[PDB]
């Protein structure tokens, strides 16, 4: 009553201000932890009112920061779990055709989900080996921990290069290049205005993305649109290493602030002076790669085309939970 309430408040806070926790996987983990707290130690009797509670909570949990859509699709997945569990123990209306056994069963489903979600990096890693060959080239914009495990375990058997460009709005790919070269993968850094030059010398593009929309048109750290577009221009294949929970059943133009216009004090620093009263410096940190540039999503169940993602949608999130 009070503990869960202060937890929800602290969580909507540290989701509304900045990045906390850091790794998106850890955000999924804490969202499932909070949702398990709610599904266990709250007040609800019928399954329908429980769905409505998860609704009028997730509305806020996703409207706090409407760009971090890991928590959003985690809510939607627990909703689909409620629906599937209802379908099972019903043997579409929502009557309390069953009781507290439902609670333990939902907890079991969420525990199985949390376990198969903890073992995500290990799966994508142990299946990375089947895409890389000796003496080739791999660009990785930004710094994604999953692409990181991918490219730092697929170097226990082969040797290549990883021309890791850097996200320019605020240089974060540098930590990526360092965390590779400490494992010794002949890396290379450059400034992301240097892509349509070096792209003629690239054998593959393992970008890391924040989300995957329905069409497969992902939503990834900025600049990745122009990288992906140069890749399409050379028809060098992209291997968008994006795990399962980073999926989301929304759609391209179904939202404003698709991007995330962040404090433009890091593009044109404040120390500038007079001219900062007339210019309107922009800063979108999240771009929108169109679908047909992508080629091969390495989910944690094996590769999948781009024009196959809607099946994963219909298998993960219910077709009526697209507005929540």
Q: Is 284 in the site for another protein (CB under 8 A)?
A: yes
Neighbouring CB atoms inside 10 A of 33's CB total 14
What CA–CA distance (Å, rounded) separates 215 from 221? Answer: 18
Alpha helices in 96-194 (DSSP H): 101-118, 121-126, 145-153, 173-181
Assign 3-state DSSP to the chain and report helix, strand, coil percentages, each to 5. 45, 10, 45
> Closest approach of Cβ 202 to another protein, in Å?
11
Site residues for another protein, 208-267, by CB under 8 A, read 222-223, 225-226, 229-230, 233, 256-257, 259, 261-267
> Closest approach of Cβ 4 to another protein, in Å?
12
Q: Is 324 in the site for another protein (CB under 8 A)?
A: no
What CA–CA distance (Å, rounded) separates 284 from 221? Answer: 9
Site residues for another protein, 152-211, by CB under 8 A, read 161, 166-172, 174-175, 177-178, 181-182, 184-198, 200-201
> Closest approach of Cβ 264 to another protein, in Å?
6
Neighbouring CB atoms inside 10 A of 237's CB total 15
Q: Which two tokens stand for residue 290?
A: 């169109």
Site residues for another protein, 285-304, by CB under 8 A, read 287
> Closest approach of Cβ 208 to another protein, in Å?
15
> Closest approach of Cβ 172 to another protein, in Å?
7
Cβ 255 vs Cβ 66: under 8 Å: yes
Contact with another protein (CB under 8 A): which of 22, 56, 88, 282?
282
Contact with another protein (CB under 8 A): which of 235, 275, 319, 323?
275
């Amino acid at each position: 009553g009070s503990e869960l309430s202060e937890r929800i408040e602290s969580f909507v806070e540290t989701l509304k201000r900045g990045g906390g926790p850091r790794s998106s996987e850890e955000m999924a983990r804490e969202t499932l932890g909070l949702l398990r707290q709610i599904i266990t130690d709250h007040r609800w009797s019928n399954a329908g009112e429980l769905m409505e509670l998860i609704r009028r909570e997730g509305r806020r949990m996703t409207a706090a920061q409407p760009s971090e859509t890991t928590v959003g699709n985690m809510v939607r997945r627990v909703l689909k779990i409620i629906r599937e569990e209802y379908g099972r123990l019903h043997g579409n209306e929502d009557f309390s055709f069953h009781y507290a056994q439902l609670q333990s069963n939902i907890i079991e489903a969420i525990n199985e989900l949390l376990v198969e979600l903890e073992g995500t990096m290990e799966n994508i890693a142990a299946q990375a080996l089947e895409h890389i060959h000796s003496n080739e080239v791999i660009m990785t914009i930004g710094f994604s921990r999953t692409v990181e495990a991918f490219l730092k375990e697929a170097a226990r058997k082969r040797k290549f290069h990883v021309i890791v460009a850097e996200c320019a709005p605020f240089c974060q790919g540098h930590e990526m290049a360092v965390n590779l070269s400490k494992a010794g993968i002949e890396t290379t850094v450059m400034t992301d205005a240097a892509i349509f030059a070096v792209m003629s010398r690239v054998n593959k593009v393992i970008i890391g993305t924040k989300t995957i929309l329905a069409n497969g048109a992902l939503r990834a750290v900025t600049g990745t649109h122009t990288l992906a577009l140069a890749a399409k221009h050379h028809s060098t294949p992209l291997i968008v290493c994006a795990p399962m929970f980073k999926l989301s059943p929304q759609f391209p133009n179904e939202e404003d602030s698709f991007h995330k216009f962040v404090a433009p004090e890091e593009v044109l620093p404040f120390t500038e002076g007079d001219i900062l009263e007339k210019v309107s410096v922009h800063c979108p940190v999240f771009d929108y790669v169109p679908p047909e540039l992508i080629t091969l999503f390495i989910s944690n169940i094996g590769g999948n085309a781009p024009s196959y993602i809607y099946r994963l949608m219909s298998e993960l999130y219910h077709p009526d939970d697209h507005v929540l």
